[PDB]
Amino acid sequence: AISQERKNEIIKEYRVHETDTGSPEVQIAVLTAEINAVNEHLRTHKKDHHSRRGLLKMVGRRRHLLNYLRSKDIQRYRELIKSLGIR
Amino acid sequence: AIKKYKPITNGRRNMTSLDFAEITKTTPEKSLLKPLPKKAGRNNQGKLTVRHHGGGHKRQYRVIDFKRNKDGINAKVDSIQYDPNRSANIALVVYADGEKRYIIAPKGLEVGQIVESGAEADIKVGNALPLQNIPVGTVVHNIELKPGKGGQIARSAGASAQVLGKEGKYVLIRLRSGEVRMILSTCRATIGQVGNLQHELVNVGKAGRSRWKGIRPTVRGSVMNPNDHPHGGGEGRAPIGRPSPMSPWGKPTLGKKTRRGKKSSDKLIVRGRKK
RNA sequence: AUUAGCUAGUUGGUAAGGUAACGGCUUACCAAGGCAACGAUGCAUAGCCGACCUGAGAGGGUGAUCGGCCACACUGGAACU
RNA sequence: ACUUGAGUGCAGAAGAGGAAAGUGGAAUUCCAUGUGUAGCGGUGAAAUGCGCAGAGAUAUGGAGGAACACCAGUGGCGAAGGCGACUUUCUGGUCUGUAACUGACGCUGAUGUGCGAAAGCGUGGGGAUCAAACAGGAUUAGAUACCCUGGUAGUCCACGCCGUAAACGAUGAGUGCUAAGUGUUAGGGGGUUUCCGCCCCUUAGUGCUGCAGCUAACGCAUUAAGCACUCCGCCUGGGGAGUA
RNA sequence: GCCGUCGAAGGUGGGACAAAUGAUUGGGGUGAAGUCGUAACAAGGUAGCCGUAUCGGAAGGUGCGGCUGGAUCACC
RNA sequence: UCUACCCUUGGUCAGGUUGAAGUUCAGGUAACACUGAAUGGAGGACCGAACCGACUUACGUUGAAAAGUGAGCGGAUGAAC
RNA sequence: GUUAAGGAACUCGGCAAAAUGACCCCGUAACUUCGGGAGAAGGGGUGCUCUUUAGGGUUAACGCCCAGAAGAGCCGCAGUGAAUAGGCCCAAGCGACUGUUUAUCAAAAACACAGGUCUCUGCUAAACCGUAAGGUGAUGUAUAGGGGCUGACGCCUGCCCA
RNA sequence: GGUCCUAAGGUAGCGAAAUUCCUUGUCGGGUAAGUUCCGACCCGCACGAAAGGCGUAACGAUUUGGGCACUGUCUCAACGAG
RNA sequence: CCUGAUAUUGAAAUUCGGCACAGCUAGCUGUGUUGGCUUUCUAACCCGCACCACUUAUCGUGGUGGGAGACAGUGUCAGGCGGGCAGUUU
Ligand SMILES: [Mg+2]
Ligand SMILES: [Mg+2]
Ligand SMILES: [Mg+2]
Ligand SMILES: [Mg+2]
Ligand SMILES: [Mg+2]
Ligand SMILES: [Mg+2]
Ligand SMILES: [Mg+2]
Ligand SMILES: [Mg+2]
């Protein structure tokens, strides 16, 4: 998990737009900070599977936000891919 | 664990090795090695006692500290090396006096450890301290038997013991074979379980590397004509025809017990073996 | 679809030859493509349309005399005016 | 350009939702001695068996392994299979109220892919109870049957597989819609908030009774089997046969 | 008239698909029930059924899980 | 001092052939991550001399030799000599 | 050493001989432990001289060695023209494999084997040699040592304790 | 189903076999012709589950039957060389 | 090999039986003598148990410990298994 005194920092370095808690930019950045932290629980624990249903769930949510973002902005879609490493 | 093999040949069909991932600093230390000439069962008369021995590969004995002296000195652990004379691995500790020595390595060991009788003695893996100073339910190995002698019982790969309780002068130890037994209260004990636990799944796979370890073939009894084995020849193959299957010197081998009425072992062995 | 892969001069440029003409139309060096789950490839059954049959109609089943087009000539190639 | 759908932010609760590590109590079995002693069992009736070489009964003793009484109920949770002793670190989702936020970012899913009750199998540990197979006594004209003291694979853990069930609400998902009464659980609205007093409301799960309607009938009936829309899966007499 | 490129049929060889057939052999439906038992439907006299093992001449019986499509008094 | 195992110290095997683990790059992955191309040089692995054996056969049998020669034959980086 | 026509009719039996043999190419089935089968099988080409062009390294470069393509032409009965170098296929039986055995009438289907079990051993271990001292087991200690039977892998191992 | 007896009184799988006397068992395939060989039947003189039972790719100077190829082994021998 | 009887081999005990009839009501009590079972202590004996000396020898003997202890090892006698091995008959 990520706490809500450190979740707010994840938004601020990915503000190409001003004062937006929800964007095609900022929640995608929050989701990666969990995917990089759920998948390190899931390199130590493996017998659980209810987490691995929440793991499959959150990525396919981002694949719909990212495919929306492909069909609005030419250079903001490509920026968000290049900024975090995520495809 | 065990690295498998792929059947490119009929020899390597099901052979299975043991991966050397817990070995650091593969070269030895050239001041604690002593030479080791072989013998196949050749006592001081030149004859042949114990059968099926000899040959294989040259070895060189590595001097092991089983005493665990040097009380109250922090010993680091530097490098975990390979030892061919025995089933466990080996360690190279350095006491703070610069006296580099060898320890048989317990399960997880890289940190740095202590030998002291009762100072605080820091009950962790790798620390040796006498059995009056060990609380109950504590898995130990490499116990001494006589006081000050040297660690004898449970020195294998993946072996262990267990302290049960404390009697009037002795302690009470459950051994790996399942035999409760009293040991004097000032024998030392390393705390922990000795490493290299994947050892008995090493499928040798081939009659050649079961042969350069120092083993020779073992001819069965029923194929010797009756000059030299009590399961003598007869026409064709034959059932054994005795009331009891015998060893090559007359004594029945399948069932009969062998130990004798012995000093300082009848009043101490409470439970027998379980097999 | 109880058949999933398929062709190799196959896909393309270039060359000169080649027929009424375009042409991998047949050959030569380079070039890495054709087609495909929107049915590519392979099996068994079949001449096909205008029309005939039945049906409230929508549809189902048929292909004969009668007209248009097509292929074949005991069998398998190749020509000459 | 728009903000009802869908997503995040902030304010808050309820959980047997998982996964590793410790820890605790009560019963079952087996070993040590006494006091003690001819019966303990089992049953329609009986035994086979353990016992007189000291069994059960009876006390302290210590060895193990497994489930988790009372709370526990209609309650809760997860998409299902399922999940009930406690404490700790790590870990998903749902819900209540809404000031904020870019501004249709949706629903369905042929192949694909991932979890799957128990039984069963592979390689290792550990094995108290219950116990297929198995031997025993009688009940039976006959008896693995049903009944009785015994009993191994299995049951528990770690790892890799197999993927089926009356895997069920025998009712696929998504949205809006249409008479009403009576409970219950976690939250919010109107009170001096009377504390498990009370009524007054609004929202989400959860059960019961009951119009119009639909249905062969039974019965559903706001958690539809009603009126409609979208997309997916399947059926076309009974055997042969979920076989070749 | 001879030489060369292309070229049907023929001969050689290993395959690929259907069809005809074959000593025996394993289930299946059909009858007419003679032979051996009663496993279901009433609580069918051991409540049934679905998965999954193991045994028996014959239906079938037992083990561990789920279901009511389980009488009595519906198992308070 | 022959032969049988055995301990300590040495020596020897022309050549040619397939291509195991891995490692790196690229393709997809961020789900449960597995295909290709290079590189690496594994084995009581394959063909073959020295070298070690002794399967078939002919000759030899008051032999050239009290166990052999002619033509072929098996192992040949190992449980080898 | 060669042989007309025939080609196992010879014989206990294809015993001895005869054919196949190198490199470079096209192409290759059943079956399986997915490595193998496989040199599977069945097929083609090779000689000398002359003209053009693309290939390494050495070197300032003429020079030198290593090579592969098409095309054109010549000659013989025959172009690895001499010597050296696998015959192959279908179906069964026993043993899994490489190995080892009767120096000198038997090389195997026998012995070993990797793996499965069963039993014995708490350390001055059991076991064996030695009248004893001493040693081997081992400067090893139940994942380790001595013995009995079976003989990779797969599916399994049924009743009887008088 | 009756009944004698034994401590219970041959299960899965294979079966004229390296195991079968009589026997050249019997029906099918193979050849112009097959006491050997291969596939089946089962009445096992006397297979049988670690003196293991049944299968099996690969490997064999193993043992048994059938094809193509090649040939003085053969019908039938003749000539030449040391 | 296994198991007794004694020798080397000493003290402290605590109970239990055979005699003895000691009390004089089948079983009580308690003395004079016999044979055990156990339990503990250390002085022999034993240690392929720790440093220390002979000595800059993991053999040996000598020395304070620590263990085990009248059992073990050993001598004589006696019984039982004993084709592991021998002499011979059939
Ligand atoms: Mg399970
Ligand atoms: Mg269920
Ligand atoms: Mg020789
Ligand atoms: Mg030899
Ligand atoms: Mg071949
Ligand atoms: Mg073949
Ligand atoms: Mg000795
Ligand atoms: Mg004799």
UniProtKB/TrEMBL annotation, chain A:
Coiled coil: none annotated. Keywords: Ribonucleoprotein, Ribosomal protein, RNA-binding, rRNA-binding. This is Small ribosomal subunit protein uS15. One of its GO terms (biological process) is translation. Signal peptide: none annotated. Part of the 30S ribosomal subunit. Forms a bridge to the 50S subunit in the 70S ribosome, contacting the 23S rRNA. PROSITE patterns: RIBOSOMAL_S15. The gene is rpsO. Belongs to the universal ribosomal protein uS15 family.
TrEMBL record, chain B:
GO terms for cellular component: large ribosomal subunit. InterPro entries: NA-bd_OB-fold (IPR012340), Rib_uL2_dom2 (IPR014722), Ribosomal_uL2 (IPR002171), Ribosomal_uL2_bac/org-type (IPR005880), Ribosomal_uL2_C (IPR022669), Ribosomal_uL2_CS (IPR022671), Ribosomal_uL2_dom3 (IPR014726), Ribosomal_uL2_RNA-bd_dom (IPR022666). PROSITE patterns: RIBOSOMAL_L2. Residues 123-252 form the Large ribosomal subunit protein uL2 C-terminal domain. GO terms for biological process: cytoplasmic translation. SMART domains: Ribosomal_L2, Ribosomal_L2_C. One of its GO terms (molecular function) is transferase activity. Keywords: Ribonucleoprotein, Ribosomal protein, RNA-binding, rRNA-binding. The keyword Mitochondrion does not apply. One of the primary rRNA binding proteins. Required for association of the 30S and 50S subunits to form the 70S ribosome, for tRNA binding and peptide bond formation. It has been suggested to have peptidyltransferase activity; this is somewhat controversial. Makes several contacts with the 16S rRNA in the 70S ribosome. Part of the 50S ribosomal subunit. Forms a bridge to the 30S subunit in the 70S ribosome. Belongs to the universal ribosomal protein uL2 family. This is Large ribosomal subunit protein uL2. It comes from Staphylococcus aureus. The lineage of its organism: Bacteria, Bacillati, Bacillota, Bacilli, Bacillales. The gene is rap.
